[PDB]
Design goal:
The PDB classes it as apoptosis. Keywords: beta-alpha-beta-beta, apoptosis. It forms a monomeric assembly. The entry is titled "Structure of the Alzheimer's disease amyloid precursor protein copper binding domain". The chain has 66 residues and is of the alpha+beta class. The protein has one domain: Dna Ligase, domain 1 (2-Layer Sandwich). It contains one helix and five strands, in the order ββαβββ. The strands form two sheets. Strands 1-5-3 form a three-stranded antiparallel beta sheet. A two-stranded antiparallel ribbon has the order 2-4. The termini are far apart.
Length: 66
Amino acid sequence: SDALLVPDKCKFLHQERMDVCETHLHWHTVAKETCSEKSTNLHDYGMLLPCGIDKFRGVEFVCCPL
């Protein structure tokens, strides 16, 4: 049940970006923006690869078509 990609009807964008390092809010926005810029909305966002106390490098968001 290791679904690290598109599960049901939502699009899962589970990718680790060990390049950038921002707060949970930044990746949330970048993630939401990437989906909202298209025809989808972020429902289940996730941030991996911790970089700092509040910073990360990974993002795992599931956005459904709207």
